[PDB]
RNA sequence: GCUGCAGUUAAAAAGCUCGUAGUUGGAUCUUGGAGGGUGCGCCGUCCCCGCCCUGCCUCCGAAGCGUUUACUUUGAAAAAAU
């Protein structure tokens, strides 16, 4: 059955970009997949996305572009401590430069700069790049 | 899959065809009728597809049998469907 | 008067009595009283459309609704008719109650009901600002900048008395919830 | 209540005594016991039952000489066979890094339990406090019962 | 999909969306209570109650005309039945298998069924357990389950 | 081989299923304008912050005082040698 619903949100995303494709139709989507989607959307990783209402869970269109290479999920949401998103960030991404690992903090669901500007830290939500 | 499609705004024959579950935002695919019987002259409700016998306000008439669909309603009569 | 009416915790007045007033001049008549007179009304508040025709809003107990909804079309009609220059219409006060915190503080106060729910409550204010219509679908769009919008799908049939008042409903609802509001027609499945 | 007394010994609070004496009605004297009690402190409300009660047991934080001092823990009742003590399980996390998902934990923690308390029931959840050693095993006192018919699984009235 | 099989299948309700109506239902909250009443007064389980009704008379959700399924409108009322209705079938179907299996002994395919039947059964009371539906201790036993469910 | 293994044929998916512990669990309840750090020759560039385009009650402090936690964050308490 169903652990996570993130995780399906993303994979689907990431075969919709390989494939060549421009739009993508999730389900069944929750705040956390909004607000995933919506740092993606902030940094430029994705277009503008929808949230269709049928009378259930939800069902997303996410309008790609084609800047992604990949958006991952890290399951399960481990524990970070400021001086372990240090080491995430270097496990999971290109370089140092760019890329964000997004993280769930009391503050927020957030990219790490985001969360080393606010000074918090949390628990590991996923990536893109 | 040829990188076209509005999945936001897919077509009405098209998303015709797909089965109930499978529909953009889900809807059925099954309705309700008024139904005659020229001896009466009132007009039963009755559902697409049925299960029960269903029988007219007074007459033990009969108003359709079920099966694994659609009830098929029952020779002589009529039926409007019909609302928003 | 101003007392009766207008009340639910604060007299007052202007166009809360202007209203109140045509309610009675409506209600001499036949069955176009005894069926009002029950209802009753907390409030009115006046909020504009963009080129300057005004929208008054009018708000109700919540029980009274089913009664209100009774009538409505034919008393909405008699009220942009005698009122004219402004789109009338009916919502319904709600509670909304806020979601516990924690520290806010907590003295596990008793539960609360969905049907207290702040989005659950805009959402009754979306169904409120549309009539028998009916709404079919929602949608929600993110734009670039960071910003969303509710396209709010609607019916077909009957749509007309709705139809030139679109704009009032997006921008009452602004007024209210602070979101954008976007509205569509369909589609008829076949 | 069932008498206390009960034992072979008679049952008395140390030093608070008695003189019944002679004239009318009570007769003695109604209350026929003075009774001392005291507040725990940390703000543990001292029930009614601690002052109403005529039960004796020392090891009683309100009724009793012993002083609360000490870890203050929570726990879930496991067992109440024992007269006058439970068993308490407590949960625990341990973490284990040197790959990192810590596995649930639980240790058992022996417990006198004050007459003035009752409903003790297994599954319900307690507030002990830390004390003297009572008995070679106990440790602790049970403080607090915070109870609830909650956990629905079943309905609870009053 | 299924538990105690390997079948796949999606097959369904597919509710409507439209949040009211149906419009085309005049009728009123107060006749399809009485006609549920009425219904269940004649024995009828809810699941029976909802269909008979959806068919013969205009109820698309008894729902939707009223603010309340129906097992809740029956035990309202004071019809609701001592197990839930879907715990009774499986415990009625576990003994119709269970007289099968007596009679015959040398069927070990209803021998393995049995004991599908059972475990959902189980699994179904604790979860009511769990919920307070039934006392705490309540158990499924072949021997009392006979005389049990009738 | 956590990070970071392999198991159709190479060493390796139990004949199959039920199933307790254990692990694991759907959606859904709040919505530019200047302050301070270091570069570049009075000007600005680039963070960070309260904002625009949310602890109740008792009745400022105090107190009542916490719905439980885990979590994470900021402090103290934290032997020297190393």
Not at chain 2, 14 to 29: I, M, T, Y
Not at chain 3, 157 to 163: G, I, S, W
Not at chain 4, 52 to 71: A, L, M, Q
Not at chain 5, 32 to 45: H, N, R, S
């Amino acid at each position: 059955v169903r652990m996570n619903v993130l995780a399906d949100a993303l994979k689907s995303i990431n075969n919709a970009e390989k494939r060549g494709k421009r739009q993508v139709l999730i389900r069944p989507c929750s705040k956390v997949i909004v607000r995933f989607l919506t740092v993606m959307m902030k940094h430029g990783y994705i277009g503008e996305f929808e949230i269709i209402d049928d009378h259930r869970a939800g069902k997303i269109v996410v309008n790609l572009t084609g800047r992604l290479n990949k958006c991952g999920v890290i399951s399960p949401r481990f524990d970070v401590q400021l001086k372990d998103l240090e080491k995430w960030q270097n496990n999971l991404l290109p370089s140092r430069q760019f890329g964000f690992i997004v993280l769930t903090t009391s503050a927020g669901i957030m990219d790490h700069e985001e969360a080393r500007r606010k000074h918090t830290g949390g628990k590991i939500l996923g990536f893109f790049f | 899959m040829p990188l076209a499609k509005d999945l936001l705004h897919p077509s009405p024959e098209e998303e015709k065809r797909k089965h109930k579950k499978k529909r953009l935002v889900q809807s059925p695919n099954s309705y309700f009728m008024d139904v005659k019987c020229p001896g009466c002259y009132k007009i039963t409700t009755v559902f697409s597809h049925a299960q029960t016998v269903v029988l007219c306000v007074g007459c033990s008439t009969v108003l359709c049998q079920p099966t694994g669909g659609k009830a098929r309603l029952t020779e002589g009569c009529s039926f409007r469907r019909k609302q928003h | 008067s101003a007392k009766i009416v207008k009340p639910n915790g604060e007299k007052p007045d202007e166009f809360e009595s202007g209203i109140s007033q045509a309610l009675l001049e409506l209600e001499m008549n036949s069955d176009l009283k005894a069926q009002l007179r029950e209802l009753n009304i907390t409030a009115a508040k006046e909020i504009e459309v963009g080129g300057g025709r005004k929208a008054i809003i009018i708000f109700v107990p919540v029980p009274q609704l089913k009664s209100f909804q009774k009538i409505q079309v034919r008393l909405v009609r008699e009220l942009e008719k005698k009122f004219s220059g402004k789109h009338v219409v009916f919502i319904a006060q709600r509670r909304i109650l806020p979601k516990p915190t924690r520290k806010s503080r907590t003295k596990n106060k008793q539960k609360r009901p969905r049907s207290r729910t702040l989005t659950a409550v805009h959402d009754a204010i979306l169904e409120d600002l549309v009539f028998p219509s009916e709404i079919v679908g929602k949608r929600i769009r993110v734009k670039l900048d960071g910003s969303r919008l509710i396209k709010v799908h609607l019916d077909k049939a009957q749509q007309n008395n709705v139809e030139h008042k679109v704009e009032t409903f997006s921008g009452v609802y602004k007024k209210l919830t602070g979101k954008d509001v976007n509205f569509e027609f369909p589609e008829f499945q076949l | 209540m069932a008498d206390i007394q009960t034992e072979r010994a008679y049952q008395k609070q140390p030093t608070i005594f008695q003189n019944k004496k002679r004239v009318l009605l009570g007769e003695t004297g109604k209350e026929k016991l003075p009774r001392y009690y005291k507040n725990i402190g940390l703000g543990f409300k001292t029930p009614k039952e601690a002052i109403e009660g005529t039960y004796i047991d020392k090891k009683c934080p309100f009724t009793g000489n012993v002083s609360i001092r000490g870890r203050i823990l929570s726990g879930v009742v496991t067992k109440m066979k024992m007269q006058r003590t439970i068993v308490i399980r407590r949960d625990y996390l341990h973490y284990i890094r040197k790959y990192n998902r810590f596995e649930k934990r639980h240790k058992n923690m022996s417990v006198h339990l004050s007459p003035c308390f009752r409903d003790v029931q297994i599954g319900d959840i307690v507030t002990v406090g830390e004390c003297r050693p009572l008995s070679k095993t106990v440790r602790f006192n049970v403080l607090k019962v915070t109870k609830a018919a909650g956990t629905k699984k079943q309905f609870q009235k009053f | 999909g299924r538990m105690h099989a390997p079948g796949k299948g999606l097959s369904q309700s597919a509710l409507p969306y439209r949040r009211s109506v149906p419009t085309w239902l005049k009728l009123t909250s107060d006749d399809v209570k009485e006609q549920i009443y009425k219904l269940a007064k004649k024995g009828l389980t809810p699941s029976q109650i909802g269909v008979i009704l959806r068919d013969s008379h205009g109820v698309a959700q008894v729902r939707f005309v009223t603010g309340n399924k129906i097992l809740r409108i029956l035990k309202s009322k004071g019809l609701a039945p001592d197990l839930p209705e879907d715990l009774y079938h499986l415990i009625k179907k576990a003994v119709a298998v269970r007289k099968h299996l007596e009679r015959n002994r040398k069927d070990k395919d209803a021998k393995f069924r049995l004991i599908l039947i059972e475990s959902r059964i189980h699994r179904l009371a604790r979860y009511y357990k769990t919920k307070r539906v039934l006392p705490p201790n309540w158990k499924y036993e072949s021997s009392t389950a006979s005389a049990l469910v009738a």
